[PDB]
Amino acid sequence: HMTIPDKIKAVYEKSTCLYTSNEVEAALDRMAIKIHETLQDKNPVIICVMVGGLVPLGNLLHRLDFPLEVDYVHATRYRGDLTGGDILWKVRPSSNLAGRTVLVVDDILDGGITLAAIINEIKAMGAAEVYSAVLVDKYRKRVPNGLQKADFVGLQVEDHYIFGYGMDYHEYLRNAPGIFIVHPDHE
Amino acid sequence: HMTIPDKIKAVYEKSTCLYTSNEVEAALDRMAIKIHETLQDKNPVIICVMVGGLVPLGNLLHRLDFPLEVDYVHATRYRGDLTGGDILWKVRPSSNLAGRTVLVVDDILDGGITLAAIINEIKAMGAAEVYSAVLVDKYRKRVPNGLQKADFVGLQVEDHYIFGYGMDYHEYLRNAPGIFIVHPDH
Numbered sequence: 285h286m287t288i289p290d291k292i293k294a295v296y297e298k299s300t301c302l303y304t305s306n307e308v309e310a311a312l313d314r315m316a317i318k319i320h321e322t323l324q325d326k327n328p329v330i331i332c333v334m335v336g337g338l339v340p341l342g343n344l345l346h347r348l349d350f351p352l353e354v355d356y357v358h359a360t361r362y363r364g365d366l367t368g369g370d371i372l373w374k375v376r377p378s379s380n381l382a383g384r385t386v387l388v389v390d391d392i393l394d395g396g397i398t399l400a401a402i403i404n405e406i407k408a409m410g411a412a413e414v415y416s417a418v419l420v421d422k423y424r425k426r427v428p429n430g431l432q433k434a435d436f437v438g439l440q441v442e443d444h445y446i447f448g449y450g451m452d453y454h455e456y457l458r459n460a461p462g463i464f465i466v467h468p469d470h471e
Numbered sequence: 472h473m474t475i476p477d478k479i480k481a482v483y484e485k486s487t488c489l490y491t492s493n494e495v496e497a498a499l500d501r502m503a504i505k506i507h508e509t510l511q512d513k514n515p516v517i518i519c520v521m522v523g524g525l526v527p528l529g530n531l532l533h534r535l536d537f538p539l540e541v542d543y544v545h546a547t548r549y550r551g552d553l554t555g556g557d558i559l560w561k562v563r564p565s566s567n568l569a570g571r572t573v574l575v576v577d578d579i580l581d582g583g584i585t586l587a588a589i590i591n592e593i594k595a596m597g598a599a600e601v602y603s604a605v606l607v608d609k610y611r612k613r614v615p616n617g618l619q620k621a622d623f624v625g626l627q628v629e630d631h632y633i634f635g636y637g638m639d640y641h642e643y644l645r646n647a648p649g650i651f652i653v654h655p656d657h
């Protein structure tokens with residue numbers, strides 16, 4: 285009977301397009317300019333926040349024209365975890381970050397807890413400066429211990445269930461060419 | 472003293488453009504079409520070989536039009552390690568891969584030992600099928616131990632020391648918009 289790949293095609297067919305890939309590229313361009321002005325002379329280590337950060341960072345990187353390094357980090361947060369302690373670390377920041385300017389790049393700012401915990405841990409390693417870049421910002425959705433606002437924001441959105449351009453629908457659909465809203469039948 | 476940044480800026484100024492960003496886009500386009508025809512129904516897990524595969528994969532992903540999943544892996548190898556016997560794993564393949572069609576994505580196929588070791592460890596996790604994609608193939612440079620041919624290749628190149636589009640020069644220049652060759656004097 286019915287498969288997961290079958291449901292995924294269906295989810296995609298029922299979805300509503302919120303941003304075309306061209307609009308995302310535009311947002312990525314806007315961010316690049318802002319990142320340039322701030323970080324061009326900082327010799328930053330740009331940290332990809334796995335796995336949501338992958339396609340945004342990939343597309344963003346070649347728009348960045350100043351010396352930089354790349355690294356990555358991976359952390360997961362439980363549903364009911366509001367402190368930031370009790371977040372599972374898959375890939376930790378390194379001591380190499382000590383005395384370095386760091387830019388953290390993720391797909392979405394929601395509650396803000398994952399990214400705050402990640403930033404704290406990067407700081408705990410001795411990073412001179414820490415910035416944050418986010419493709420989408422769910423501006424109406426912070427919680428007290430969350431990273432309140434990000435330094436660089438591609439797009440501002442309402443609380444939709446969204447996917448595409450690195451954002452998953454249950455691990456699928458990171459490859460969808462834009463930002464899509466999940467039909468209420470599929471949320 | 473001379474900063475690492477200053478040296479990097481200089482290394483980029485003397486560099487020679489092998490391929491433009493536009494050329495790289497077109498390469499990625501070719502790969503996407505071939506990947507579609509091979510894997511459109513396999514429900515693959517596409518696996519990013521860190522950190523070289525990040526920008527190639529990131530750019531590639533939205534070109535792929537079929538159901539898929541994403542994961543990453545990280546293995547490094549000593550140049551003197553002529554077998555895969557002493558590759559040091561940063562991030563290992565998961566058990567979740569058991570019974571799955573897997574695509575491995577990397578920046579460059581050089582000798583092939585690092586790639587073949589990654590494929591083998593993936594196979595050992597019980598993977599059903601493993602395919603390999605690479606942005607650039609140094610076709611002349613293969614060793615007997617390494618992975619001989621890649622299933623998908625973006626571009627074939629001579630043995631230049633190269634960077635850009637995810638490929639580094641001592642961790643730098645992964646952001647260079649295209650593929651570039653270091654000046655002989657570097």
Ligand SMILES: Nc1nc2c(ncn2[C@@H]2O[C@H](COP(=O)(O)O)[C@@H](O)[C@H]2O)c(=O)[nH]1
Nearest residue numbers: 392393394395396397398444445446451452
């Ligand atoms: N795919 C998807 N993921 C989301 C959405 N909202 C939040 N997330 C997930 O939650 C993470 C951020 O969580 P926070 O710690 O900000 O509450 C993101 O990196 C992302 O994985 C959404 O609408 N779609």
Ligand SMILES: Nc1nc2c(ncn2[C@@H]2O[C@H](COP(=O)(O)O)[C@@H](O)[C@H]2O)c(=O)[nH]1
Nearest residue numbers: 523579581582583584585586632633638639
């Ligand atoms: N930046 C850069 N990396 C290279 C080059 N040649 C080989 N490498 C690195 O070595 C890996 C290939 O190793 P092999 O498969 O030959 O053991 C690639 O994934 C890449 O990270 C090059 O010209 N430039």
